[PDB]
Amino acid sequence: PKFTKCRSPERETFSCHWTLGPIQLFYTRRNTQEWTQEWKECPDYVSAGENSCYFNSSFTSIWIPYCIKLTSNGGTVDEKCFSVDEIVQPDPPIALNWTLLNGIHADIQVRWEAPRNADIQKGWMVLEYELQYKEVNETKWKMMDPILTTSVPVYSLKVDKEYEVRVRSKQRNSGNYGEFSEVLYVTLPQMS
Amino acid sequence: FPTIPLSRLFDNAMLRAHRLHQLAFDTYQEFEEAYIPKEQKYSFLQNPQTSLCFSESIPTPSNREETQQKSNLELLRISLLLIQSWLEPVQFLRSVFANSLVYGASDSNVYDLLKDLEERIQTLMGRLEGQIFKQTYSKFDTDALLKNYGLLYCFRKDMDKVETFLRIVQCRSVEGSCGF
Known part of the structure; x- marks a missing residue:
């Protein structure tokens, strides 16, 4: 053991x-x-x-x-x-979701929620998030610089491809990175 | 008579506290990742004569309940005392900061930050107007490697305390500075 x-x-x-x-x-x-x-x-x-x-x-x-x-x-x-x-x-951020920010390319806005057990509202914790996304068929992920906020736009996504997004969080200046959220699949609107 | 929003001030205090904690935390990781294998860390921890920090003579809360039960003045005072406790001893990590892959690490930069936040907290106390109020800062009573890793270990902990305590007073003192 x-x-x-x-x-x-x-x-x-x-x-x-x-x-x-x-x-x-x-x-x-x-x-x-x-x-x-x-x-x-x-x-x-x-x-x-x-x-x-x-x-x-x-x-x-x-x-x-x-x-x-x-x-x-x-x-x-x-x-x-x-x-x-x-x-x-x-724990991972919850309630992941996206929405068009605003036709070969598209800009979206992803938003999630902080883990429910983290007392952020009262100061005991301060998290930062790291978002990752990729086309569903590739194997590597594009990382994104850490953010203090729970919304983040992802620019220039190709509308003819489906994407994945997962966000993970960590206490600022302390510990390591926690688990990733469940993936968020993003299929954009395509104008023929 | 109304009062000037405290946000700009809190915002500046909080950037310094995070800068200081950030230096403590990276600096420490580095050194530990070069000279301290978990075996020494444990024997370091199980031997208070080497691990018990000087600053620990200042009575601070140890869990969330305790902390959120203290007023802003006490939390500010505790933070003030921890910052003052490091003004002199930071002159000791000169070398450690020297041979460190700096990124801002130096006994001088770190010291100027301490002098900076110290004044900023004194201002915050006047704006937000016991053992803690009667107690002064902790004097540092003092192998080289076990002296440094100890200095570093205590520097990181206290900086986590300061950033924490200030964050708490901030969420209480500033309109949704932590929410939405």
Whole structure:
């Protein structure tokens, strides 16, 4: 066994998933001056799914280091130390959609929604998005510089081709990039 | 009597805080990606004598509830104190910033930014008029590599704190500066 990964979707809670016998997860976090708190076994083995551990808002704090260990009947199978702020990785944007901005080419405007769990409205989170699109038959994607907003025009799309768009988000200056949204297929109007 | 919109000011404070956090975060990633393998990182973390930051003597909130429960003045004060705590110690990463693939990284640029935001937050407090209010900044009590990675590690954390706390006061103080 080995840690598959630990992540915090909205900087308020996190969970860890892993790939002998029954594997247990122990954790401790530096509370106060020193790591004085004894190891406590995973508080929730169901919530974040099979082979995971979910730490609700009650066990989640930021800027404080944590250490987790996967244990088996043979001893420690894996260890990992981090502070929640390093593991932020937001969920995908939702409600993706487009609309003509305004005949071989066409300009469109794509818009989505921020992941519902991200407190953007109150300041606890600031995301930036990265949009990608391509013709449905090609294999590479055209990236687009990151944006602070939830609408973005895509210019000069050829009307005679169908496109795909997926947007992904990340907490500014923190963490890595999260999952991509479900793709948005775009078939433009063609004037014969 | 009405009041002048705080947006321009918040806007400028917030650009600096993100510039500072951005430098802290990249600078740190770089160094860590060259001299610190996860093994040392863990032993660094499990040993407070090396990982516990000087700035940590300033009582700051640690989760969302805690933070959004503090007034704007306290959050501004906490941020002021963290910024002051770094004015002197940034003179220490001179070399790290030196050999870094800069992109703006230098003890001087970073220091001028601190001086800049420091004043900007003092202005914001006068516009928005306890231990925290009686407490002064944290003095830095001080191998080379473990001293630097520690300075960097603490620089990133505090900069995340400042950008966060200021963002919160901002969403509260400025008409939909976070919404729609």
